[PDB]
Design a binder for this molecule. Structure first.
Ligand SMILES: C[S@@+](CC[C@H](N)C(=O)[O-])C[C@H]1O[C@@H](n2cnc3c(N)ncnc32)[C@H](O)[C@@H]1O
Length: 284
């Protein structure tokens, strides 16, 4: 009897760049070590689960809408055994995070043991763009974060930066349905398809297509995150900006965490990384 699985042959040109992203998420998640209640908005397949465990978070609440992803998080938890401090409890909530923030806050608060006052941190990595659809969706996101947090709680966001993408497209003179491409030794490494007519950054609703790597030109559409607009809506809802910084700024520390991968990062890697950034906000 035999079972065989053949993946497409895939080169390693994304080695160093994806190790940089992992290092960044780890340094961010390390900052909330041993907190009692941490909520993750858009937790997916649990890619950050190893990080949350290494940080000793005590109660992780992970919310996502994709039952398939969440099952992979369950398999990941139960395969792969752990025993390091003191053990994190995990609560997975299957929920569409575009629904009214009041309902989502009620379901979360009904999780056995969730604090009436609220959690200590909200983490969301590469998710908030799904909610940049229109003004109501951004307000909903800020009201949901306000309801789930205790005062002084913090929001730890990670996102593609819409200002930088628009600036990137303009400097390369990319018009409506055209594509910016990275290219390395004659292969398209990264790419962005412009899908907005406007030449000025809109609050909400501007789409681009990002190339999915190792596909044969499959582009997946996302909205642009206007971080100015995001931070401004969060300000209207009781949050102060704490920190806002490009992923490119972790590259020097990265040299101390694997000198090897540091030296292999290419100029296309650095340009792609520059499009992503961290944003910390605190509830007043
Ligand atoms: C880029 S992924 C991965 C997020 C994860 N924290 C990570 O860094 O890998 C974004 C996740 O957002 C989830 N998502 C997209 N739209 C959503 C919605 N309306 N409600 C809840 N989750 C959503 C997807 O299921 C996906 O797992």
């Amino acid at each position: 009897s035999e079972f065989m699985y053949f993946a497409g042959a895939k080169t390693g040109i994304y080695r160093a760049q994806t190790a940089l992203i992992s290092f960044i998420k780890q340094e961010i998640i390390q900052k909330i070590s041993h907190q009692s209640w941490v909520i993750d908005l858009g937790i997916g397949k649990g890619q950050d689960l190893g990080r949350y465990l290494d940080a000793g978070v005590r109660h992780l609440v992970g919310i996502d809408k994709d039952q398939t992803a969440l099952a992979e998080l369950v398999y990941r938890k139960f395969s792969h055994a752990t025993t390091r401090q003191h053990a994190t409890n995990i609560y997975v909530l299957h929920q569409d995070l575009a629904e009214p923030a009041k309902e989502i806050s009620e379901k979360v608060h009904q999780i056995y043991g969730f604090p009436k006052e609220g959690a200590s941190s909200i983490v969301s990595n590469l998710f908030i763009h799904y909610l940049m659809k229109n003004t109501q969706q951004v307000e909903n996101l800020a009201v949901l974060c306000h309801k789930l947090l205790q005062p002084g709680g913090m929001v730890w966001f990670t996102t593609m930066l819409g200002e930088q993408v628009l600036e990137l497209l303009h400097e390369n003179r990319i018009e409506l349905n055209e594509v910016w491409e990275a290219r390395e030794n004659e292969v398209v490494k990264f790419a962005i398809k412009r899908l907005f007519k406007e030449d000025i950054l809109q609050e909400t609703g501007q789409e681009i297509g990002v190339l999915l790597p190792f596909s044969n030109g499959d582009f997946y559409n996302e909205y642009l995150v206007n971080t100015a607009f995001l931070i401004k809506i969060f300000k209207h809802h009781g949050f102060s900006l704490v920190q806002k910084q490009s992923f490119k700024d972790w590259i020097p520390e990265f040299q101390n965490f694997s000198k090897s991968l540091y030296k292999i990062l290419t100029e296309a890697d650095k340009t792609w990384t520059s499009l992503f950034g961290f944003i910390c906000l605190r509830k007043n």
